[PDB]
Subunit: 257 residues, 4 copies
């Protein structure tokens, strides 16, 4: 009885909900830089149940642009509804001996993806996110080929947060490690009037060939010392590739009870 | 142990959270139109526990622009962080004989207010929201005085949803009824791996003198038949005024258990 | 005194909003050919521009671009070098030679908008969305038979145009209206109390990818006035999805009406 | 052929992005007076514009505006008639008479931006935020002693200027640089292979509210180049918060350098 829906707003038929129930399909383009983080700083961002990664200092800065849709594909016919840009930080960790990634910070530039992020425990905030695109004709850009350069930038509240650059020098069939492991999130929502460690369950994960080369990464101040603690000590390889996956729901790792 | 925060993202000191804990202060400018809704349609948007209003057909369309801050006032020094625009629909209802308002739909144009809305059970989505401002010098606008006209508009996904207009003809000290009663929301968040009816508890509610006159309201298609069921049968008086309140937290009306 | 290719002037010239040409462009296009009322089209042609050998041929063109100056500097800041665009093209001729007239265009960045007016190209501001091909996963279409691509323009929070293309084959035949000179009217409003010039944009190094062609669909909406509405499609033809590059060098005078 | 006050031309003239003047403006201003290096300021003055009786006087000006044409039509669509602005003013004189030079301005809507260039006003695009007075509740400042008001400009996702004013009294003395003619350089880039004109914006019905004045604070950031940076404050003076109206009619020629 009364109005219903997968999410707010509730409505008599359920059609009004901002979010659709999973599964959701994603197809995107990524510009990523591997980097070295202070392992002791990283540890502070891992909740109970998540241990330091096998390489505790391994981190990544990830820019992506996405199209997404529900099972029926309906969103694809309206490009404004199905596209968004994203930046995230990944930290290496483990759950019961199994490699995973912790995402301590993420930004996107559309509201549906942001809220859907919180549904999963992924800590998405809003930002302005730009990313180079490969070209195949003309001179105004870079090709996916040796010598090709690609850049990403994130600003929040009108100031810069991260800039990244990659100049690729070869193609491989080796997915970057932090982009090829489960993400372990903390599901929690502010009390108005019981956090859980969850993994996002995915299927049909697909990578294009990976273009790899030099990486560059600059973090800026503004977001606070907690975020700055994760700035790079050293910057590693950059990677440019296409990525797809289907996201089904959450798997409980720990109730803490 | 591990990272903490009022909300995501969690961080070692808690400083990174997107949201600050309540209370939050609001100061805004409102352009509102009273209207008559199909009472039977309205009833479908009321969850168990909420009965039809004493005047079941009374509704309102409300445009507002706001500044807000936490108790320490910190957000006020960065206008980009403390301002947002909003449009909402209000329906008249009652909880145990006491008049309240149900907000079945709301839109805002900033991410913090949107998420904070879901914390309260208020069904905020994202939109583009415009609203006339009174002027006191020159000719390019209307004064808060007899004959003054004020307009509001909401577009979502690049198409119009609502347009409203008010031409004021007198000032009163009578707050519009639907803007002077508690809001009863449904607190619910999508399951990833138990709705509650709550009232938002407010204090220090303050209205300027109310400028009242003719109202006009146009709803457009696009958002679905559920939303369209709430379009006006007849349009009543418009009101232009300033409003302040302090929002403290939620009060449980019903657990349904 | 201060100098610059454009405003703002500054002591070294570095502050100018616009850089001098040439400028390079690399874009992704979703285009639909259509039939326009020939009488309506004629009314948008200024003196010197005559009706096309096919007076009713028109096109609706969505594109996303990267651009840069000769030194390539803008490319390192994606926010500075990218923009989206929608434009209408009408078939015409000047002194016996086929050209295209752009009576309306919209973009979503200020530099391209002003640079348009420098050329006589009538760019206004809008919100412009366009599907992108995907190569992995399920959330999109491949550039392959059956792939669908959509475009939308809204202005002042209202729909103006929606277009869609479902491609069915690849060709090496660039769409006619996208492979002729554009003839613009270079004119600026008089601020201190005329003198329009008909000018063509001079381009080099024009390049097309293979052209994916199929069915086209186009819908115009009301709101922008009866003048724009007069160019609404009577019938909709083929759609095309392709990549495009050119270098834009400056203008050449077609007529100054002297 | 098609006509219009500005592009796009159309059969009836209705499609033009800009309407002819006069245009009315009603705005809310947060302004900070400051001291600029006089040598730096001189380098931004074109021929005919000479240093101010006080060469070092400058101002940083945040404003939010509504505007409309003579018929008032734009007022009914708030999205069409509103914009935000930040500008720098420098003190100067022309033929012995005090004026202001605006070497840099930013706005957040396309119509005002293009209309600026029509006048020779060097408007670019930016993100501009400004505090608003409140009259109820606790989330803001009143226009009263102790009230604080802030402004910020970011361009390409980087800070450019932050300003703040804490007012302590009301006066009937309009800020000097906001109460003189603006002398602009009307010039457009040559597209077909000069001829700048020094022009003043002709205004009438200038009106100020009472002026709330107090302490001023101003911070410039790097990023826009050494040319803009040269106008950074050496010292910051008084701040002012007030409402402003004017009607802008057209341009008058100061010099065409012939």
């Amino acid at each position: 009885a009364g109005p219903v829906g997968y999410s707010l707003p509730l409505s008599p038929t359920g059609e009004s909900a901002m979010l659709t129930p999973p599964p959701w399909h994603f197809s995107g383009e990524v510009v990523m830089v591997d980097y070295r983080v202070d392992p002791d700083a990283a540890r502070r961002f891992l909740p109970p149940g998540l241990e330091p990664g096998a390489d505790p200092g391994a981190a990544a800065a990830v820019f992506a642009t996405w199209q997404w849709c529900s099972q029926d594909g309906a969103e694809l016919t309206d490009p404004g509804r199905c596209q968004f840009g994203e930046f995230l930080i990944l930290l290496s960790c483990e759950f019961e001996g199994r490699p995973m990634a912790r995402c301590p910070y993420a930004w996107v530039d559309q509201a549906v993806p942001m809220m859907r992020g919180w549904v999963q425990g992924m800590p998405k905030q809003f930002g302005v996110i730009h990313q180079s695109r490969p070209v195949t004709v003309g001179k105004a850009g870079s090709r996916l080929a040796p010598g090709g350069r690609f850049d990403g930038a994130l600003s929040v509240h009108g100031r810069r947060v991260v800039e990244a650059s990659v100049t690729v020098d070869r193609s491989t069939d080796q997915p970057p490690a932090l982009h090829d492991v489960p993400l372990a999130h903390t599901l929690v929502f502010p009390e108005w009037v019981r956090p859980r460690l969850v993994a996002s369950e995915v299927s049909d994960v697909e990578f294009s060939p990976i273009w790899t080369g030099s990486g560059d990464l600059t973090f800026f101040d503004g977001l606070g010392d907690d975020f700055g603690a994760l700035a790079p000590l050293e910057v590693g390889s950059g990677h440019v590739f296409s990525y797809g996956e289907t996201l089904h729901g959450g798997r409980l790792l720990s109730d803490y009870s």
